[PDB]
Design a binder for this molecule. Structure first.
Ligand code: OLC
Ligand code: OLC
Ligand code: OLA
Length: 429
């Protein structure tokens, strides 16, 4: 017997009973089709199976089992407005949900780490089949996620609510827990979800994504100079010596009064083109392009490109000048685009896409919960208008978190052309 409070939330709960039902059906249809297709695509392709993309298959299977189990039960619960499944199902569904969120966050972390290790080596030789250590990684990811979900199976049980005469059974984390550790988990449930299942995955993925993109940049500027110098060879020793020459060059840029303001203005890609000109003719020579450097600082790419075209540097070496100038105008690596640079652009866009989708889907829920414990008080007479506002955001946050179970296959379709052809070929079959 636990009666509810006032008026405001009742009309909103009824309004969202239809919204949540629509979102649940969309996530179910889009999720069971996208994740099943993605699982088939990853494993059947031998060139993705022997790499870090097998972790995306683990991510897809984790969402897939969450879709088929949690979504239909939650739809039945919303429509019936009562829990009619018994005690066993009241413990299974939260356990399945908690394990799925753990599989998602641990597969995302392992993918960003493996993608960093993949770009940290020259001439890496892939094996045949799933790597043995990646298999241990996936097993451990699922083992840890199940163990961390055991409290949900222990704590959840059915209670009876008294709504001014009407009795309705509710499945929730029981306020009275049997053991001291289990009662502590009831108080720190939301903080534990925010710390381990949001702050930890974001901190690790963004850290290794930064390391991966920095390493991609030092290799792109490496191949950029070797292409412009006619050719060369890669390797850790060759890159280490080349990075020292680049670091010594930028130290001369930052001491030069003419090149310091324009270099700080440019982005990482356009800074590589300025470094290229320094490698070719020295800093005293690059500082002579006073008009062009001013236009680059004012971010007039077309005007600076035209002004650089009418120069002795352009006439003597047209081919190299056109590529360096194109890099200034576009700000991309299109003039030096090869199989290596195109591979790194594909990797960087997919990893950044999955992490961003995960962060945007779970940000409203946690943001709505911090507003509940920093702005709400039971005493205040004006709580029902404020409670009315807080419940809307929490419902929005619950729906946004459910969309993450179907957003990953769609996200890869729009960002990656490699997966887009794989999705079309799979559904054309
Ligand atoms: C009782 C309190 C327990 C609190 C929780 C502690 C145990 C789970 C944490 C890390 C296990 C990660 C290893 C499992 C396999 C995943 C490999 C991986 O990629 O880990 C990502 C990141 O390093 C992970 O911190
Ligand atoms: C540190 C990272 C995770 C540990 C999270 C432990 C969170 C423990 C919170 C216990 C607590 O004091 O809860 C306060 C209440 O929920 C509101 O005032
Ligand atoms: C911080 C509070 C949350 C701690 C998370 C603990 C997760 C599961 C560990 C195993 C629990 C089994 C209890 C019996």
């Amino acid at each position: 017997i636990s009666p509810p409070p006032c008026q405001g939330p009742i009309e909103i709960k009824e309004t969202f009973k239809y919204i949540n039902t629509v979102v649940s059906c969309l996530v179910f249809v889009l999720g069971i089709i996208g994740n099943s297709t993605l699982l088939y695509i990853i494993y059947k392709n031998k060139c993705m199976r022997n790499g870090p993309n097998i972790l995306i298959a683990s991510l897809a299977l984790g969402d897939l089992l969450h879709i088929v189990i949690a979504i239909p039960i939650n739809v039945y619960k919303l429509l019936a407005e009562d829990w009619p499944f018994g005690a066993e199902m009241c413990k299974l569904v939260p356990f399945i949900q908690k394990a799925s969120v753990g599989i998602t966050v641990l597969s995302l972390c392992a993918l960003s780490i493996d993608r960093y290790r993949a770009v940290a080596s020259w001439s890496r030789i892939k094996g045949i089949g799933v790597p043995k250590w990646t298999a241990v990684e996936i097993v451990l990811i699922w083992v840890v996620s199940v163990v961390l979900a055991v409290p949900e199976a222990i704590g959840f049980d059915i209670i009876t609510m008294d709504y001014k005469g009407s009795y309705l059974r509710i499945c929730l984390l029981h306020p009275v827990q049997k053991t001291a550790f289990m009662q502590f988990y009831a108080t720190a449930k939301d903080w534990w979800l925010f710390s381990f299942y949001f702050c930890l995955p974001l901190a690790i993925t963004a850290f290794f994504y930064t390391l991966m993109t920095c390493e991609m940049l030092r290799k792109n500027i490496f191949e950029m100079l070797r292409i412009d110098e006619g050719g060369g060879s890669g390797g850790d020793e060759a890159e280490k010596l080349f990075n020292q020459d680049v670091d010594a060059a930028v130290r001369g840029i930052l001491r030069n009064a003419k090149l310091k303001p324009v270099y700080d203005s440019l982005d990482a890609v356009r800074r590589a083109a300025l470094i290229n000109m320094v490698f070719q003719m020295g800093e005293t020579g690059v500082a002579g392009f006073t008009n062009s450097l001013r236009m680059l600082q004012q971010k007039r790419w077309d005007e600076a490109a035209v002004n650089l075209a009418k120069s002795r540097w352009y006439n003597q070496t047209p081919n190299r000048a056109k590529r360096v100038i194109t890099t200034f105008r576009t700000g991309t690596w299109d003039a030096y685009l090869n199989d290596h640079l195109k591979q790194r652009r594909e990797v960087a866009k997919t990893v950044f896409c999955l992490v961003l989708v995960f962060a945007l889907c779970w940000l409203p829920l946690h943001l709505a919960r911090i507003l509940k414990l920093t702005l709400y008080n039971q005493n205040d007479p004006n709580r029902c208008e404020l409670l009315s506002f807080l419940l809307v955001l929490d419902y929005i946050g619950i729906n946004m978190a459910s969309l993450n179970s179907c957003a990953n296959p769609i996200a890869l379709y729009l960002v990656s052309k490699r997966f887009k052809n794989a999705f079309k070929s799979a559904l054309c079959c």
